[PDB]
Design an enzyme around this catalytic site. Structure first.
Site, PDB file in Angstrom:
ATOM      1  N   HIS A  87       0.797  -1.356   0.100  1.00 11.83           N
ATOM      2  CA  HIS A  87      -0.308   0.045   0.229  1.00 11.83           C
ATOM      3  C   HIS A  87       0.684   0.833   0.251  1.00 11.83           C
ATOM      4  CE1 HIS A  87       1.223  -0.181   4.373  1.00 11.83           C
ATOM      5  NE2 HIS A  87       0.182   0.621   4.629  1.00 11.83           N
ATOM      6  N   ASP A  89       0.315   5.055   1.449  1.00 10.39           N
ATOM      7  CA  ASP A  89      -0.326   5.498   3.031  1.00 10.39           C
ATOM      8  C   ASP A  89      -1.501   6.191   2.241  1.00 10.39           C
ATOM      9  OD1 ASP A  89       1.703   4.257   4.632  1.00 10.39           O
ATOM     10  OD2 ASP A  89       3.273   5.303   4.607  1.00 10.39           O
ATOM     11  N   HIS A 218       5.014   0.684   0.442  1.00  8.63           N
ATOM     12  CA  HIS A 218       5.814  -0.730   1.627  1.00  8.63           C
ATOM     13  C   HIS A 218       4.563  -1.794   2.357  1.00  8.63           C
ATOM     14  CE1 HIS A 218       3.397   2.706   3.468  1.00  8.63           C
ATOM     15  NE2 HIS A 218       3.663   1.923   5.068  1.00  8.63           N
ATOM     16  N   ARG A 233       6.006   6.330  14.370  1.00  6.37           N
ATOM     17  CA  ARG A 233       6.442   7.226  13.516  1.00  6.37           C
ATOM     18  C   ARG A 233       5.491   8.761  13.087  1.00  6.37           C
ATOM     19  NH1 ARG A 233       1.792   5.584   8.510  1.00  6.37           N
ATOM     20  NH2 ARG A 233       0.346   5.719  10.272  1.00  6.37           N
TER      21      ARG A 233
HETATM   22  O1  LIG Z   1       5.403  -1.071  10.639  1.00  7.42           O
HETATM   23  C1  LIG Z   1       5.811  -0.653   9.076  1.00  7.42           C
HETATM   24  O2  LIG Z   1       7.114  -1.181   9.445  1.00  7.42           O
HETATM   25  C2  LIG Z   1       4.943   0.319   8.710  1.00  7.42           C
HETATM   26  C3  LIG Z   1       3.590  -0.174   9.132  1.00  7.42           C
HETATM   27  C4  LIG Z   1       2.348   0.725   7.995  1.00  7.42           C
HETATM   28  O3  LIG Z   1       2.187   0.627   7.385  1.00  7.42           O
HETATM   29  C5  LIG Z   1       1.255   0.930   8.286  1.00  7.42           C
HETATM   30  O4  LIG Z   1       0.541   1.247   9.671  1.00  7.42           O
HETATM   31  O5  LIG Z   1       0.612   1.604   7.453  1.00  7.42           O
HETATM   32 NA    NA Z   2       1.982   1.989   5.848  1.00 13.20          NA
END
Ligand SMILES: O=C(O)CCC(=O)C(=O)O
Ligand code: NA
Length: 254
Positions: A87, A89, A218, A233
């Site tokens: 996906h 984001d 990713h 994040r």
């Molecule tokens: O843990 C990760 O590497 C990314 C998590 C993620 O992509 C999300 O919650 O949208």
């Molecule tokens: Na993500």
């Protein structure tokens, strides 16, 4: 200014050494980071063990505007502790994030990797007649409420690179039956996730990744079972995507 940059895979990803991330980085360093980000799509900093929640947030403000249940003592920091699906984001919204800065706080001893795909390289490798088709397609992205129509091809506002804009949030390609939408999506998305267009990172505590959400997707690998995995994040506000003909994305529901 030339950073100590070490490419990870052949078409995406680079580790940057000799840089201690903080709110105090100078303009030349910030500019070189932004350039390496655009060029390599995802960049990695190891051994950032001095970075805490507040300094991660302060560093992030140097690259853009953080977007707003958060980590105590911060306004924008969020904890994740799973996203094993390809996906980009938040593409169900109109002006989705341009980047995220993600720090490893607790890392599984085995498993827990993240993989990024270069959606600009995926576009570039399509045979010309297929690029021309992709240039004309629109897709509906949804969180199934929020629905947005985005061009399948986005022209990057800094580099001008064209990049496929697809992934898990796509509900359908506009103007096609469901069967045809599925086939066309499978072709284009298949190029995004082709191994040659990806880089896989194995995390150690103190690693920080930053990726350009306008030219990547990713996937967080869910192979680590009950081993604790904690990452933090910060997400930076992005722009309304522009297509190849200059048309803008638009929210169509809520
Ligand atoms: O843990 C990760 O590497 C990314 C998590 C993620 O992509 C999300 O919650 O949208
Ligand atoms: Na993500």
């Amino acid at each position: 200014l030339e950073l100590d940059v070490h490419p990870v895979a052949g078409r995406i990803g680079a580790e940057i050494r000799g840089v201690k991330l903080s709110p105090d980085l100078d303009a030349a360093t910030v500019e070189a980071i932004q350039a390496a980000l655009v060029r390599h799509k995802v960049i990695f900093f190891r051994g950032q063990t001095h970075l805490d929640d507040q300094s991660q947030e302060g560093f992030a403000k140097l690259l853009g505007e953080p977007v707003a249940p958060v980590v105590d003592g911060t306004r924008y920091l969020l904890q994740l502790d799973r996203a094993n699906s390809w996906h980009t984001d938040v593409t169900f919204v109109e002006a989705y994030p341009k980047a995220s800065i993600l720090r490893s706080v607790v890392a599984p001893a085995s498993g827990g990797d993240t993989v990024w795909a270069n959606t600009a390289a995926a576009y570039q490798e399509l045979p010309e007649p297929l690029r021309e088709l992709a240039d004309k397609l629109w897709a509906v992205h949804s969180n199934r409420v929020y629905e947005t129509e985005h061009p399948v091809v986005r022209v990057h506002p800094i580099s001008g690179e064209r990049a496929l804009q697809l992934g898990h949030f796509v509900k359908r390609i506009k103007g096609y039956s469901l069967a045809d939408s599925q086939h066309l999506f499978a072709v284009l998305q298949g190029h995004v996730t082709r191994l040659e267009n990806t880089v896989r990172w194995r995390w150690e505590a103190g690693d920080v990744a930053i990726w350009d959400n306008r030219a990547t997707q990713h996937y967080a690998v869910d192979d680590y079972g009950t081993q604790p995995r904690i990452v933090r994040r910060v997400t930076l506000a992005g722009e309304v995507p522009v297509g190849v003909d200059g048309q803008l994305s638009r929210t169509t529901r809520k």
